[PDB]
Design a protein around this ligand. Structure first.
Ligand code: ZN
Ligand code: ZN
Lengths: 178, 29, 180, 30
């Protein structure tokens, strides 16, 4: 439609460059990126790092906004879901990194820049394995992508979102419905 | 920012939308 | 497309964009959309709507005016003046028509609309006074022989050429571009 | 310091534009 003019504003205007980006945009981006409604997800480190940054942004915004009633439960639930979802995403992205041959290994090792949380067994196991030769990782992942198929992380992410926009809709001044 | 001077697209919105069209045209083909 | 519903949700409903400047291409696109500018009247005539549209049209005229500060686009300038004045006068004319067709006539909104948008014109509008209040039956076809006098097609043309002229001058002289 | 921001109400040139836009569009639809 002519809606693109509006888009032309956001993507292309001086006044919207240096401006706050709201949380529902990052929400909608997460839902869209992972098709929250089975891997039509695009794994490229720019994309995944950006997405994880929006995920982190949502976690922080949710955290700060969370500052008779026990939303202790919503909070720690959201904690579990966030950490397990993010750990999953970084895991699958590392997998997609490994599957490629040759391996862009310096973007790999540093991939866990903010994403490679400091529980160091996940990753040192992940990378000792950086350079045995390719089959080992291809059937290491194809051993592991019927360990925890993406469906389950789709579920975890979807309930992280659903939980989040619940808490935000209730306590704080939020609405998500047109 | 030195990108407004240069008339360049530099916004959280811009990064978002562009990521959006990389994903969507990844989908299309 | 929730990823676009998000964007519209920002524009229509967000703190940071209520009190924010609205650029000209949004009003351009609004005109193009509102009057179906293309190569025939699905235009919605409501004084709220039409006054808003004329306000954005005027906004375009002002930005065009101010931004215009070998080539001689003086020619384009005077052309755009002709086109703008005839287009606006036309829109107000047809809106007045649409006001008249309804019985009873809401004439305080009618007169108001002619005191906000009918002063770039002349005083034949006093004529409208006396046809403001003769009775509907003689008038609707006193009015309706005029769209083979001034069919909307031609004002569609005038508007479309005002727009294309305008964004030409803006694209050339000023730092404007319009294609994605 | 606007009383519609105060009141959490939609009050923007964008808002007026979009709303007019969809009055036209639902004039189109039926
Ligand atoms: Zn800048
Ligand atoms: Zn306000």
């Amino acid at each position: 439609s002519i809606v693109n003019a509006c888009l032309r504003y956001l993507g292309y205007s001086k006044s919207m460059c240096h401006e706050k980006m709201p949380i529902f945009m990052d929400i909608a981006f997460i839902e869209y990126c992972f098709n929250l409604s089975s891997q039509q997800i695009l794994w490229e480190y720019s994309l995944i790092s950006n997405a994880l940054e929006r995920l982190e942004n949502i976690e922080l915004e949710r955290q700060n906004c969370m500052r008779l009633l026990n939303k202790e439960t919503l909070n720690n639930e959201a904690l579990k879901l966030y950490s397990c979802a993010k750990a999953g995403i970084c895991r699958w992205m590392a997998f997609h990194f490994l599957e490629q041959e040759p391996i862009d290994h310096i973007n790999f090792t540093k991939f866990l820049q903010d994403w490679g949380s400091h529980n160091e067994k996940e990753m040192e196991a992940l990378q000792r394995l950086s350079k045995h030769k390719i089959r080992k990782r291809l059937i290491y992942v194809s051993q592991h992508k019927k360990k925890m198929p993406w469906s389950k992380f789709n579920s975890v992410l979807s309930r992280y979102i659903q939980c989040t926009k619940l808490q935000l809709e209730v306590f704080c001044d939020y609405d998500f419905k047109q | 920012c030195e990108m407004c001077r240069l008339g360049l697209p530099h916004g959280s919105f811009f990064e978002l939308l562009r990521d959006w069209k990389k994903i969507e045209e990844f989908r299309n083909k």
